[PDB]
Design a protein around this nucleic acid. Sequence first.
RNA 1: UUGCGUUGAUAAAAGUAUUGUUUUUGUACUCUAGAAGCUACAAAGAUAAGGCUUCAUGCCGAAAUCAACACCGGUGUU
DNA 2: TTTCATTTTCTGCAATACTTTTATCAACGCAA
DNA 3: GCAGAAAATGAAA
Lengths: 814, 183, 183
Amino acid sequence: DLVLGLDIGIGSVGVGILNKVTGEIIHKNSRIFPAAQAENNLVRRTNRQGRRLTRRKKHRRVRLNRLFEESGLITDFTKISINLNPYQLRVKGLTDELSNEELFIALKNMVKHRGISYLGDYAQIVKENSKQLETKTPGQIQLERYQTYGQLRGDFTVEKDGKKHRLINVFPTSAYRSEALRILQTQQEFNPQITDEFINRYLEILTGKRKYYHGPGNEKSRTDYGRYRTSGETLDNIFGILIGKCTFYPDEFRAAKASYTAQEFNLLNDLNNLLSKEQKNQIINYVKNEKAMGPAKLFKYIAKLLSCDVADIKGYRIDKSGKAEIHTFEAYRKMKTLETLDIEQMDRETLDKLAYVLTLNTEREGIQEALEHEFADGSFSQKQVDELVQFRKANSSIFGKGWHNFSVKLMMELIPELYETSEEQMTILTRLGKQKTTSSSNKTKYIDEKLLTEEIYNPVVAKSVRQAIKIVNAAIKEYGDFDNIVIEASRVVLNALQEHFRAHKIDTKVSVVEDSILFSYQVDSKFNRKISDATIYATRQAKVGKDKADETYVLGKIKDIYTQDGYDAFMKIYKKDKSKFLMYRHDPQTFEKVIEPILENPFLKYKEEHGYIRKYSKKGNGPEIKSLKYYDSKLGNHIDITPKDSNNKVVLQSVSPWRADVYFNKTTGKYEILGLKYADLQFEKGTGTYKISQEKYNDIKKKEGVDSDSEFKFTLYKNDLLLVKDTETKEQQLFRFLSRTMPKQKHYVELKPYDKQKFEGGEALIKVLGNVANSGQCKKGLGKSNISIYKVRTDVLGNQHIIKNEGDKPKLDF
Amino acid sequence: MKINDDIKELILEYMSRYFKFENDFYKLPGIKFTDANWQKFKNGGTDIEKMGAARVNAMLDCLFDDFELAMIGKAQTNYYNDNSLKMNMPFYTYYDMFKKQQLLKWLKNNRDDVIGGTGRMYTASGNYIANAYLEVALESSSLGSGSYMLQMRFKDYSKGQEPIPSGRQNRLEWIENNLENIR
Amino acid sequence: MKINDDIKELILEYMSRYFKFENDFYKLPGIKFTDANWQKFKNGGTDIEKMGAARVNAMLDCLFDDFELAMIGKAQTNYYNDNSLKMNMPFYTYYDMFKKQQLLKWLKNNRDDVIGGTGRMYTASGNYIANAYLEVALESSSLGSGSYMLQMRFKDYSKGQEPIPSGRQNRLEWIENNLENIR
RNA sequence: UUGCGUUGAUAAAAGUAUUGUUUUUGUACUCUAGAAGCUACAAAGAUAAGGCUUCAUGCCGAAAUCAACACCGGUGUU
DNA sequence: TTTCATTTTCTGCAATACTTTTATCAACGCAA
DNA sequence: GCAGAAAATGAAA
C-alpha cells in the first residue's frame, strides 16, 4: 500500500510516492521533455509543398525540350543564346514570322511565367491588370512597362506625375492562353512543321495544373500522399478515405446529409419530439410530393390534421430568439426539379450513392469520373451529367454541408422501429442493445498509450499524457502494484484509468484534483533535421584591417539604404571602417557624393527632395543607388556549394551538430572527442540508404585530432548525461551534453546543467574545469590531462547507471 | 610503385584539379607543410625521393583512390618500358589514358554493375567540398559498410550550365555521351 | 595506405616467409642496407615513418603486388575501427583473413576465370628462387600483352612433398582442397 | 452519455502565383577598341547536402516515435 | 618584448498573395 | 537559442 502522486505539466511531469503508513518520501523525480507544438510541422509541410513547386517548374521546361525534339524543330539545345529579348519577340511573333530558335525562346519564357487561375489591395491591382486585357496581351503590357519605366519584374511603384501607382506582374492565365494561341496560329500560317497536335500539347504543358483532390503521383510512381497508393489501390478522391466512421459500427462509413435515408430519419426524429403511424406516413407523403414549403406550412398542416390549435405543441427546434424551425426534405425537393433524369422512381440506395457523389466532389471532372466509376450498369446520358454538374454548381450551400454522424446501416435498422413506437432514437438504441462504442486493445499487466491517445485535443496534452503513462507503467513495475493514484481532457484520462483498473480487477482509487531530487531527460537522437541556415553567401579575396596577405572574406549587403534600419547599418559600418565598402575601393567619386548629404544634413529627406541618389557621371544620366555591399568577416565553418563555372567561393553557413564520439588512448592518458554534424551523413550512391561511410569517418577522425590506436569508449547525443571526475582531488560533477562547439579548437564541448535549463553565468564548476562564463554559455575543454569521463544512462524513474565502455565500434549503420 | 619526379608532377596536377585554392591541400592533418617549404617543394627545390614515407604516402592517399594507386603502379611498370611513350608525352597524360581505357573496358564488358555518385572532399579547414568529383564503381565488388573494392574518380570539364542527373539510368547515360569531357 | 609500425611487422613477417636467408632481401638494388643498419632496423631502432620514400616503397613493392597494396589500404580501414581486432590480433593475421575471404569470393562468384601458376622471386645475387610462391589471377582483367591487374600470391604450408599440378582444371581443384593449408 | 441546428478556436493533408539570395552572360554608367566587376536593369542556371525508376498532369529529403544489454505478451543484469 | 595558444562575448538568423477538403473540441438551444 | 569568429587574455621565445 503506497500512493503515487503525479503532476502533469506543459513540458514536464513530476512524481513522488508516499508510504501511507509511516509517511516518508520514498521516491521523487521530474521528467523533462520538449513541449510538443506544431510550428515545426508547419515548417516541414511548407518546405515539402514548396519543393514540389520548384520540381514541377523544372519539369515543365524538361517537357518543353522533349516536345521540341520529338517534333523535329531544333536538334541541339546548346547553341541557343540567352541574351535576346523575350517580350519583343512575343510581340514580333504575334504579328510577323519567327524562326525555330526565337519561337523556342519566346515559348520557353512564357512557360516559365504562367499566370494565376482562381478567378484586398492585391485584388484591386489584379483587377486593374485584367482591365487592360480586353484588347492587349500580357506581352504588350510588359513591353510597354519595359520601354517606358525601364523596369519590368517584381512589384514596383513608378511615380507618375499625377499620382504614384504601384504596378505588379500577375495576369490571369487565360490571357497567356490567348497570347500563345495567336502566336502559334500566325506561325502556323507561315511554318508547316507546326501541327495542331503540337499546339494542343504545348497548351496542355502551359495551362496544366493538377486538381486539389488528385495529389502527387502517377500510375507508376505510387506515392503515399495522393490518389495512387502503395497498397495497389487507386482512390478516386483522396479526401474520401478521410471521412470518419459510424458511431456504433466502426467498419461502415458515415452517411451523407443530402441522402434520402438521412432526411427521412431527421424528419421522423423531429416529428416524434412533439401522432399515429398513418399520420406520420401522411405527413411524409405530403412533404415528399408538394413544392415550395418551409416550417410554417408544415406546422399549419400538423395543426389541421390533428384538429388542434398551434399551441401546447411540446418540443421543436428553434434557431435564435425569433421563429422556430423543423426539418423538411429541402434537397429531395430541389432534386425533384431536374428535367433530364426522373427521380420519383429510382431506388433507395441509388439516392444514397447520388448524394454521396454530389456531396464529395465539387468539380465537374470529379463528378464525371465518380458517376462513371460508382454506378456500374447505370448507363447514364451525357446531358444528365451536364445537368448534374450544373445543379451541383447551382446551390452549393445545400450540398456542401457535411456528413450525418450515423451510417445507412444503422439508419436502416432504426427507421422501421420509430414508425410504431412514439419514442426517440436514443431510447430505441438502448432498447436494441446497440451500445457498442469501444476502441478495445488488450494487454495483461500494464496500460496502453495508443488506447489513451485516441482523442486529439492538442499535441501538447497528448505528449504529456503519454509521458505520464510511461511513468506509471515503470513505477508500478518497480514498486509492485499500488493503492492510490492522484494525477492532474482530465475526465478522459480519468475514465480511461478507471476502466483499465476495473477491467483487470485491481481495486485502486485514482483521482483528478532537497538533495535527492533525481532527474531524467529525453535523449534526442533523430538524424535528419535541418542541416544549416538558408541564405546563400558570396565570398571575395581581400585585405581588411591588420592583414598582410589576401584572405577570403564573406560579403554582407545592406538591402535598402533609405529605410531606418539601412541607416543604422550604414552608420555602424561607417563609424567602424570606411574602407569596408566595395564602392569605396572601386569608385570614390560616388562615395564623396554619398558624404555630401551626410555632411550637409537623412537619405529619406534627400529622396523626398530630389528622388533617388544617382551614381556620379559627367552628365546626370548615371544609375541610382539602393543597396551596398561590404566585407562582413572571415570565412570559418561552411558548406561549399560553389557552382561549376564560378570563380569565387559560394557558401552556406551556420551548420548544426548531431552527436559526439568519445575516445581514449593509452599513450598520453587523455580523452579525445569527435564531432559529427547533420550534414556529414548522406544518401548513399547505390541503394539510397542514409548513413555515413567509413572512409569519410576516418577523414573526420584524422581531422578532429584522434590517433588511430585509441579505444572507442561511447557515444553521446543531445541531453545525454555525462560524468566528469578529477583524478587527484576526486571531485565529480555530472552534466547534460549539448554540442561540440568551435570546430577550430579541439575537444571543446558545450554543457548544460543538470538542475535547470540555463546556467545564467558566473558559478563555480569543478576546480580543474573552471568557472562558467559571464554571459551564460558554458563551453569548456575536456581534452585535458588528469580527468576521467563516464556516461550516465538513467531510466524513466531517474535511477543512475554509470557506464565506462559501451561497445566495440561506433554505430554507423541504422 | 616507385617514387621520382613524375610523382611530384602528378601530385601537383591532381592538386590543382580537385582544389580551388592551394592552401587547403597543404595544411591537411598528415601532410602539414609550411608556406616557405611549400614554395620550395613546388619549385623543384626539395626532391621527392628522400622525404618522409608517411608524408608522401598521405599526399598520395588523399588525392587518389586505392584502385587508382594500383593503377599508378601498373602504369609506371608499363611506362618505363616502351620508350616512345617516354619520348612523347608526360606521365600524367599517360595515366589519364590508362584509366580512361580501363573505364571503357568496364563499360563494354559489364554495363549492369557500373554505378556512380557525387564525391565530397574534406579540406584542411574542417569543411568539405560538396560535388568535388564524380565517382564510379562496380556494384558487384562491394565490401560491407558501403566501401567498394574497385572504384575510380573523374572530374568533368563540360561547358554548359546543367548538372549531372541522379538515378542509375540517367547518370550512366550521361557518362557515355560526355566521355571526352570528363578528365 | 598509410605507414606505421604495423607495416614494419608486415614486412618482417613476409620477408621471413619468402626468403631462405635474410641477406638476399636487403642487398637488393633499391633497398641496399648494410649489416649494421639492418640490425638496427630489425630491433626497432629506426622508425619507418621518416625513412626515405623510395626505400620504403621499394621494400613494399618487391614483396606485394599492386592489388595487394590496395587490399592493405582497405584492410587498414576496416581494422583501425572495431577495437576487439586491434587488441586481439596483430595486423598481418587480419590481412591474411582479408585476402583469404577475397579469394573465397573470387572462387564463389566467378569460378570460370581464376587461373594460376608458380612464382619465381629474384634475390640480390642475380639468381632467382624457382617455385617460391603460388600466384592466382583473374583472366578477364588482364592488360593486353601484360601482367594481370587482379592478382594474389600465396605460400602453401602443406606437409607432403608434392608440388602444385599443372593444367587449369586440376590446379583450381587443388586450391579448393587445400584452403586451410595456404596462408 | 446520444442526435439535430447555428459560430468560434484548432489540427492534418492537397493545388497554385509573385518575389528574395546567389552564379554566369548581355546592355548602360566609369577609366584609358581594351580594362575594372562597383551601381542599376533583363535573360538563363541553382534554391536545405543529396538520392531513385517507372520516362513522366514523374517521386522522396527540415515532424513524431526513446534507458540499454541478455533469456523462453512476460522474465533476468552493470 | 613579438607571438602562438587557450578562454569569453556579442551579433545575427527567408517571405508574401490566393483556392479547397476532412476531423475534433467548445458554447448556445430542442428533445431522453 | 545557439553557432562561432572577434576581441581579449595568457604563457612562452
